[PDB]
């Protein structure tokens, strides 16, 4: 398999093409076009939602023709509308940012269970909650 050549997964939520610095100079230094994301990239964005932060591979050659494959949204932004919290920690021990029920996370883990490694589905719960503890998210018993 061809390893990383000219693509790094970094861009704003998939909702629209949004020709902004996060997308323009994300490819402007590598080529292709900024406006193309409204047709090919946004073909599947009508399926999911408007405003899902997902990282997409931006493989670009010297031919200025690029192919893109996305993935699940990262767990940090994944449990935001599912947790109701728009902010994040940075002082998650002096205070806390909110509350979260324990049962609210595993039912979304199967979305990320395909691209995450682990013995089974329940193992993914521990990885998220340990990360979730860094955001000050208090588990609801």
């Amino acid at each position: 398999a061809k390893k990383v050549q000219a693509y790094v997964k970094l861009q704003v939520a998939a909702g629209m093409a949004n020709p902004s610095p996060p997308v323009g100079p994300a490819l402007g230094q590598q080529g292709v076009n900024i406006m193309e994301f409204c047709k090919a990239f946004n073909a599947k964005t009508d399926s999911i939602e408007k405003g899902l932060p997902i990282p997409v591979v931006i493989t670009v050659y010297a031919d200025r023709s690029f192919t893109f494959v996305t993935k699940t949204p990262p767990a940090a932004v994944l449990l935001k509308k599912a947790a109701g919290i728009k902010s994040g920690s940075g002082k998650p021990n002096k205070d806390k940012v909110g509350k979260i029920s324990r049962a609210q996370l595993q039912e979304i883990a199967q979305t990320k269970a395909a691209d995450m490694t682990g013995a089974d589905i329940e193992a993914m719960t521990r990885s998220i909650e340990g990360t979730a503890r860094s955001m000050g998210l208090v588990v609801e018993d």
Binding site: P19, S20, G24, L27
Partner: protein, 349 residues
């Protein structure tokens, strides 16, 4: 929106040209232009989302127009009123996106004589009332009274928040036309007063006697000393390298005493050379802020027979002189800032 609408409309395309210059790879070898674009990403993505909200409101306005046969006036009336309200809210919130310290307010009499002193007293009372209805403190630093009524020259120090941000537009000359109190007949007279507003600054005086930048010479002295004076280095000379100030001392027979007092004189006469510079700088600034009160150079006119106050910088007239003279001059200073700030965002080229 007199021209800020036009300013944005001309600049609204620049909000897309910044994006165009983002993805050209010709401005990425350097850094300055890309830094400018990144700082000026289209109306600052927070306010950009605010503009998306305003455009949603405008699109809601755009609909529900192409149908007739209904007494529908009230709903789009309130809709366009809400659109204007949110438009002005957008104006203020994107205009909000320094010098907010205490101030020295100086006002003195111009043309007129005693009547100028009376008007200076009235004007200072107006400013004092405006300050007291703001939770600001006013203290009379100095006073020179005007024989009959108010002051030949009153200078006061105002302490509070954002004082200079609001009072810095009061400099210049103010003209008053009215029937004076020191007049036997009923003749109307025109007089002027002169107002200056200043900030406050730290006034550190560092004694740069740091010997790392001094050149010191010891040598023989001249005069009547017999055999001792010839074979001794009892004269001192110190030069301060950064400023080029040179001082020498040979008055006493001891090198230590000469060095000590010469160094003291160097310190005193290097401090004076900075105090004089600061004094002339502040004097010059006061001079070009003040003007020369002669009823021809002025910023606002108070006509008492007509009860009118007019401002010549923005060409705005009002018929609320009595409310102004009782300390409600806020309505005068709000529009000026509205113009002034409208030029700060334009001067980015």
């Amino acid at each position: 929106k007199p021209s800020i609408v036009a300013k944005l409309e001309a600049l609204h395309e620049r909000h897309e040209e910044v994006q165009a210059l983002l993805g050209d790879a010709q401005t990425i070898a350097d850094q300055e232009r890309f830094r400018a674009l990144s700082r000026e990403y289209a109306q600052l993505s927070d306010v950009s989302r605010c503009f998306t909200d305003w455009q949603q409101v405008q699109e809601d306005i755009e609909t529900a127009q192409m149908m007739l046969d209904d007494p529908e006036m009230r709903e789009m009336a309130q809709d366009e009123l809400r659109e204007a309200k949110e438009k002005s809210e957008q104006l203020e919130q994107q205009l909000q996106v320094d010098d907010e310290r205490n101030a020295f307010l100086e006002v003195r009499a111009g043309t007129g004589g005693d009547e100028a002193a009376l008007f200076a007293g009235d004007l200072f009372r107006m400013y004092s009332r405006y300050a007291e209805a703001r939770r600001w403190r006013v203290e009379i630093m100095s006073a020179s009274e005007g024989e009959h009524g108010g002051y030949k020259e009153i200078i006061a120090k105002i302490s509070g928040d954002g004082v200079y941000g609001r009072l810095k537009f009061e400099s210049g000359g103010h003209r008053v036309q009215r029937v004076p109190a020191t007049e036997s007949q009923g003749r109307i007279h025109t007089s002027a007063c002169t107002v200056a507003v200043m900030p406050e600054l730290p006034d550190a005086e560092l004694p740069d006697i740091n010997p790392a930048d001094l050149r010191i010479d010891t040598f023989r002295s001249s005069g009547a000393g017999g055999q001792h004076v010839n074979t001794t280095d009892s004269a001192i000379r110190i030069t301060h390298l950064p400023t080029g100030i040179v001082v020498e001392c040979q008055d006493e027979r001891s090198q230590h005493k000469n060095k000590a007092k010469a160094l003291s004189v160097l310190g005193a006469r290097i401090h004076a050379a900075e105090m004089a510079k600061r004094q002339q700088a502040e004097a010059s600034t006061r001079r070009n802020l003040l003007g020369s009160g002669d009823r021809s150079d002025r910023n606002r006119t108070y006509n008492f027979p007509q009860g009118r106050v007019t401002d010549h910088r923005i060409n705005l007239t009002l018929y609320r002189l009595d409310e102004v003279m009782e300390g409600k001059l806020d309505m005068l200073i709000e529009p000026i800032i509205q113009e002034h700030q409208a030029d700060q965002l334009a001067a980015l080229s």
